[PDB]
Design a protein around this motif. Sequence first.
Motif, PDB file in Angstrom:
ATOM      1  N   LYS A   1      45.243 -14.491  -4.720  1.00  0.00           N
ATOM      2  CA  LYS A   1      44.347 -15.355  -5.474  1.00  0.00           C
ATOM      3  C   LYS A   1      43.056 -14.652  -5.870  1.00  0.00           C
ATOM      4  O   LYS A   1      42.433 -15.046  -6.863  1.00  0.00           O
ATOM      5  CB  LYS A   1      44.051 -16.625  -4.673  1.00  0.00           C
ATOM      6  CG  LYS A   1      42.976 -16.490  -3.610  1.00  0.00           C
ATOM      7  CD  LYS A   1      42.349 -17.840  -3.330  1.00  0.00           C
ATOM      8  CE  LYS A   1      43.315 -18.755  -2.603  1.00  0.00           C
ATOM      9  NZ  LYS A   1      42.867 -20.172  -2.651  1.00  0.00           N
ATOM     10  N   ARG A   2      42.636 -13.627  -5.123  1.00  0.00           N
ATOM     11  CA  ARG A   2      41.527 -12.797  -5.578  1.00  0.00           C
ATOM     12  C   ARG A   2      41.900 -12.039  -6.847  1.00  0.00           C
ATOM     13  O   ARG A   2      41.108 -11.960  -7.793  1.00  0.00           O
ATOM     14  CB  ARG A   2      41.106 -11.827  -4.472  1.00  0.00           C
ATOM     15  CG  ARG A   2      40.606 -10.476  -4.971  1.00  0.00           C
ATOM     16  CD  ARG A   2      39.184 -10.567  -5.502  1.00  0.00           C
ATOM     17  NE  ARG A   2      38.809  -9.395  -6.285  1.00  0.00           N
ATOM     18  CZ  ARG A   2      39.002  -9.270  -7.590  1.00  0.00           C
ATOM     19  NH1 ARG A   2      39.563 -10.234  -8.302  1.00  0.00           N
ATOM     20  NH2 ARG A   2      38.622  -8.150  -8.199  1.00  0.00           N
TER      21      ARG A   2
ATOM     22  N   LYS B   1      44.422 -12.827  -8.917  1.00  0.00           N
ATOM     23  CA  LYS B   1      45.098 -13.695  -9.884  1.00  0.00           C
ATOM     24  C   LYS B   1      46.421 -13.094 -10.354  1.00  0.00           C
ATOM     25  O   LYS B   1      46.878 -13.365 -11.468  1.00  0.00           O
ATOM     26  CB  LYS B   1      44.197 -14.014 -11.082  1.00  0.00           C
ATOM     27  CG  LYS B   1      42.995 -14.878 -10.746  1.00  0.00           C
ATOM     28  CD  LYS B   1      42.317 -15.386 -12.008  1.00  0.00           C
ATOM     29  CE  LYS B   1      41.788 -16.798 -11.821  1.00  0.00           C
ATOM     30  NZ  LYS B   1      41.615 -17.502 -13.122  1.00  0.00           N
TER      31      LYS B   1
ATOM     32  N   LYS C   1      33.452 -17.463  -4.991  1.00  0.00           N
ATOM     33  CA  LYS C   1      32.588 -16.360  -5.384  1.00  0.00           C
ATOM     34  C   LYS C   1      31.132 -16.806  -5.395  1.00  0.00           C
ATOM     35  O   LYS C   1      30.809 -17.917  -5.826  1.00  0.00           O
ATOM     36  CB  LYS C   1      32.997 -15.840  -6.765  1.00  0.00           C
ATOM     37  CG  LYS C   1      31.925 -15.035  -7.483  1.00  0.00           C
ATOM     38  CD  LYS C   1      31.884 -13.605  -6.981  1.00  0.00           C
ATOM     39  CE  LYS C   1      30.656 -12.868  -7.491  1.00  0.00           C
ATOM     40  NZ  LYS C   1      30.773 -11.399  -7.281  1.00  0.00           N
TER      41      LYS C   1
ATOM     42  N   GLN D   1      27.562 -21.582 -12.033  1.00  0.00           N
ATOM     43  CA  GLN D   1      28.618 -21.132 -12.935  1.00  0.00           C
ATOM     44  C   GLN D   1      29.233 -22.305 -13.685  1.00  0.00           C
ATOM     45  O   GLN D   1      29.545 -22.192 -14.877  1.00  0.00           O
ATOM     46  CB  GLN D   1      29.691 -20.373 -12.156  1.00  0.00           C
ATOM     47  CG  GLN D   1      30.784 -19.745 -13.025  1.00  0.00           C
ATOM     48  CD  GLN D   1      30.271 -19.250 -14.367  1.00  0.00           C
ATOM     49  OE1 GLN D   1      30.378 -19.944 -15.379  1.00  0.00           O
ATOM     50  NE2 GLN D   1      29.688 -18.056 -14.377  1.00  0.00           N
TER      51      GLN D   1
ATOM     52  N   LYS E   1      32.022 -23.441 -13.961  1.00  0.00           N
ATOM     53  CA  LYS E   1      33.423 -23.286 -14.356  1.00  0.00           C
ATOM     54  C   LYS E   1      34.126 -22.502 -13.253  1.00  0.00           C
ATOM     55  O   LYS E   1      34.222 -21.273 -13.314  1.00  0.00           O
ATOM     56  CB  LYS E   1      33.549 -22.600 -15.711  1.00  0.00           C
ATOM     57  CG  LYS E   1      33.301 -23.524 -16.891  1.00  0.00           C
ATOM     58  CD  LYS E   1      34.339 -24.635 -16.938  1.00  0.00           C
ATOM     59  CE  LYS E   1      35.739 -24.085 -17.165  1.00  0.00           C
ATOM     60  NZ  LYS E   1      36.682 -25.149 -17.606  1.00  0.00           N
ATOM     61  N   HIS E   2      34.621 -23.219 -12.250  1.00  0.00           N
ATOM     62  CA  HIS E   2      35.296 -22.577 -11.134  1.00  0.00           C
ATOM     63  C   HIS E   2      36.696 -22.128 -11.533  1.00  0.00           C
ATOM     64  O   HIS E   2      37.301 -22.651 -12.474  1.00  0.00           O
ATOM     65  CB  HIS E   2      35.376 -23.528  -9.939  1.00  0.00           C
ATOM     66  CG  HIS E   2      35.961 -22.906  -8.708  1.00  0.00           C
ATOM     67  ND1 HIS E   2      36.920 -23.532  -7.941  1.00  0.00           N
ATOM     68  CD2 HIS E   2      35.724 -21.713  -8.113  1.00  0.00           C
ATOM     69  CE1 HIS E   2      37.247 -22.752  -6.926  1.00  0.00           C
ATOM     70  NE2 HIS E   2      36.537 -21.642  -7.008  1.00  0.00           N
ATOM     71  N   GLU E   3      37.204 -21.136 -10.809  1.00  0.00           N
ATOM     72  CA  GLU E   3      38.586 -20.709 -10.954  1.00  0.00           C
ATOM     73  C   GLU E   3      39.496 -21.673 -10.204  1.00  0.00           C
ATOM     74  O   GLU E   3      39.213 -22.040  -9.059  1.00  0.00           O
ATOM     75  CB  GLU E   3      38.756 -19.289 -10.417  1.00  0.00           C
ATOM     76  CG  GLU E   3      37.939 -19.016  -9.163  1.00  0.00           C
ATOM     77  CD  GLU E   3      36.718 -18.157  -9.431  1.00  0.00           C
ATOM     78  OE1 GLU E   3      35.874 -18.561 -10.257  1.00  0.00           O
ATOM     79  OE2 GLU E   3      36.600 -17.080  -8.809  1.00  0.00           O
ATOM     80  N   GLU E   4      40.575 -22.101 -10.859  1.00  0.00           N
ATOM     81  CA  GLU E   4      41.637 -22.940 -10.306  1.00  0.00           C
ATOM     82  C   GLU E   4      41.184 -24.363  -9.997  1.00  0.00           C
ATOM     83  O   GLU E   4      42.020 -25.188  -9.604  1.00  0.00           O
ATOM     84  CB  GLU E   4      42.256 -22.334  -9.038  1.00  0.00           C
ATOM     85  CG  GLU E   4      42.569 -20.848  -9.135  1.00  0.00           C
ATOM     86  CD  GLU E   4      42.288 -20.106  -7.841  1.00  0.00           C
ATOM     87  OE1 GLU E   4      42.161 -20.767  -6.790  1.00  0.00           O
ATOM     88  OE2 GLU E   4      42.193 -18.861  -7.877  1.00  0.00           O
TER      89      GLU E   4
ATOM     90  N   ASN F   1      31.080 -24.401  -9.216  1.00  0.00           N
ATOM     91  CA  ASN F   1      31.179 -23.451  -8.113  1.00  0.00           C
ATOM     92  C   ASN F   1      30.235 -23.813  -6.975  1.00  0.00           C
ATOM     93  O   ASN F   1      30.606 -23.707  -5.800  1.00  0.00           O
ATOM     94  CB  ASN F   1      30.891 -22.039  -8.620  1.00  0.00           C
ATOM     95  CG  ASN F   1      31.754 -20.995  -7.948  1.00  0.00           C
ATOM     96  OD1 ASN F   1      32.652 -21.322  -7.172  1.00  0.00           O
ATOM     97  ND2 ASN F   1      31.490 -19.729  -8.245  1.00  0.00           N
TER      98      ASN F   1
END
Lengths: 222, 100, 92, 73
Positions: free
Chosen positions: A72-73, A75, C24, C29, C31-34, C39
């Motif tokens: 997941k780091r 992707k 992170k 931000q 807009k987080h990932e997943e 964030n």
Amino acid sequence: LISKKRKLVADGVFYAELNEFFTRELAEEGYSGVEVRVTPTKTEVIIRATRTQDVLGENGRRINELTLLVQKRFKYAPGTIVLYAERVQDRGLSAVAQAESMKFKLLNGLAIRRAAYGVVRYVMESGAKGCEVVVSGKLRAARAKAMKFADGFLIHSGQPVNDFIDTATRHVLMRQGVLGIKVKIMRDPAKSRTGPKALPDAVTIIEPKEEEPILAPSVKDY
Amino acid sequence: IKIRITLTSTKVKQLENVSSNIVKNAEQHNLVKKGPVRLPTKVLKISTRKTPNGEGSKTWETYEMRIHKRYIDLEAPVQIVKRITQITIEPGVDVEVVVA
Amino acid sequence: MLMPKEDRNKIHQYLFQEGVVVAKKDFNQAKHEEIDTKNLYVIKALQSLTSKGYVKTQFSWQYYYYTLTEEGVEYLREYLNLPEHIVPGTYI
Amino acid sequence: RKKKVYTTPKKIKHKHKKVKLAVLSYYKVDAEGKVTKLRRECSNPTCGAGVFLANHKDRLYCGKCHSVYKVNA
RNA sequence: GACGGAAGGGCACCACCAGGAGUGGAGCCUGCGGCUUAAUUUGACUCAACACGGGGAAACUCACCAGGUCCAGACACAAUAAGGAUUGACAGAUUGAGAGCUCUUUCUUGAUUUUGUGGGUGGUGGUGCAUGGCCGUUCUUAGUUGGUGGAGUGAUUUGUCUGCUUAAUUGCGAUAACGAACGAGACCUUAACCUACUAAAUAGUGGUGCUAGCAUUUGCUGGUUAUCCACUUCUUAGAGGGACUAUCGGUUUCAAGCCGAUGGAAGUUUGAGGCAAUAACAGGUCUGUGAUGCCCUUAGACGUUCUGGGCCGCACGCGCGCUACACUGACGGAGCCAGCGAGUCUAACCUUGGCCGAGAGGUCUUGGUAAUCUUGUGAAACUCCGUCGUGCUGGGGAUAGAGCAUUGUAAUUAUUGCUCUUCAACGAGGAAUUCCUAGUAAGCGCAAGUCAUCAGCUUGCGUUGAUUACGUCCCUGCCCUUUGUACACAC
């Protein structure tokens, strides 16, 4: 996708990130290093530890969690990044594991001199050629002191110190501050199997084979 | 078809044994092939002060990372092309496939 | 501080989907990932979960890797009433 | 860390958080009858037709249209 | 042990008969010390700070400064309480706006929320004289330490030394020492000589696929792939070859070593670097950290929304440097030479243009995931024909006012570049003070670093190139021995 020079620099950086992650999370089990394997459409990371069953857990739950963390780091496509943890033999012949054991013993509370002596005895009997433990900090006094416990004999200059000498520098957080353990282990040149077989100055003489004289005129007729 | 294998590694020993086993298997398989073209070694230098703060003599250090790139151009059937590409895979050495 | 129920449910359901999260160190931000939420929302909510005692964090170059616990998963499992041996959070 | 005088007077006048007043929402008082509405919404569909919007003076402010709502009521 | 204006011996251009290049002489890019309302942030005070904190900054960086102003009782303890706890929100009263910072009044995501604790978070707050790590320096010089034996009551000595050489406790050697360990060497890179083991349309030769100038004379300069032959003996490569003082003289208790000559790469370990001795700085760094310990703040806090000011005020003094006193020069025209160096993927990096200007900029991608593209990086005093021509001149854009622009949502107190001007210093530059053994001094130029935009800086490279150096401690320092000491935070 990325240019190869930046890609390999980022590969080294990512190696360092995961190495720090494993050194900071996998301490109690004696983490001592990793080996990252490169292959098309598959990357493998070998985690050499001592308490490998207690890393793996039930059916490798924790190692699967760790490889999922890396996955997941990055992707990347799941399953491309795989992790395998192996019991590295001779845990005494590793600066990282010895310094980690030093850290744990100090935090447990055993006196620093006896701790250092115990680790240096263990390292010596474990086959190591030379060992040196340098403990720096507040040792039973309010002023900084350094104690250096050495056994065998090590080196400091040249390429042999670069390759044979394995060093670990750990900052143990104690109650009154931080102590610093520098564990420097010289290993055996004839226990590398890679690169130089021996010390560049230490020569080994070849065994001769004596031959008897003739002592008589013999003729081989054939 | 004119396929090409190029490898852009950092460890010279693994690089050289990869090249050696590739060329030796090709020679023992008795094909037509071009020699391993060996691009100049690219050394990445980073020059930085030894000290973290600004005290002391103005002393500098240069960390160098050496990159070795080689490539080979081949023409062959697809099956044995894939066979040669996928056998003899080693960690640390990065290889990729191109055309012409 | 305010914690929206919708984003809290989103973060909890992603934690149950995967098992772990990376947060992170990038505040504001938004807009987080997943995950659709912010964030800082994710980071603060996960710290709240740790202080509650259901998950542990690792920093490792300020990335906030997370990892759930036994009681941490079993409390939320009995909270959502999902039956036993039906849906492990981070199954193999 | 010793140069701080606070010359300006006490500026901590945090705005209230809707103190609990008497029973709010005086819709209407009609026993055994239809409860009517006041200052009704307009033909805009997004209004709930039963929501009590703000009507201060010769203008209307929509709760849903939080940022962009400027009309001559 | 330290020190000595004590002795002997050996070293070092961080030291010197000698010579070259600079500073203090002129101006200017920079960094330091004292007054300034509230600020001109902070560290560093000899070598071992001063173009250093990779500190070349207009936001940020940046904590300094004047300002509105928010949360974190994260986690658990006593509270009203869904007749409810709470963010955020409009033209209308000073803040610059859809910054509800407080409003003559409300809307309201809906158990997410407010008073003291136990344990906390954040801090570029203090303590570097609590520290870890690191780095600099004693000293980057040849020097440190056991074991077992000798000496001494002992501290402690011998080993580790009379003599002889380069850099060497480097060795030969004599010897109450023998045997070792660490430093030196040894080691790993860098540039050099390879007509070899193996090389590609990236460095070419002859026919050719097409064509021109000197002509029907045999060649050069040109311009291109698949149409091929012989090679990397120039760029770069990988089991890799030699150089070790090889040989010949002179010198020695006729022992290590020194001084002179050959294909060949040089006979001062080939030249230069990298990590570098159980010893120590109370040297720097708590401003590189989610490294804390001890104190600072604990809901108007050092965490943080926006506006700006600031190593750009100086009365002044001190440093790496850049341009110069010019006819060995300035300028105008013709030649016009290096590679290790750099380069858009979640939205741009260095640039190859049909059009315009000594200038930046547009339409498409010839450049890409890179020895093939930028780039032979065609980059500078360097070779020739003249002007200025000793008169403070054409060397000064110091300094100041007019127009075009890449960058930045703001280059205004020239960020930067290009068109235009005044003339204030400059007749071997005072006391002092710094670097230099073979292509190093110096001159001139190029690439990376910091970067949203510009080098006068640093790290690397390229072009020409050095008389007095194989000498000495006279100055500054060292190393060893002997010696004296009332020194031992050690002159």
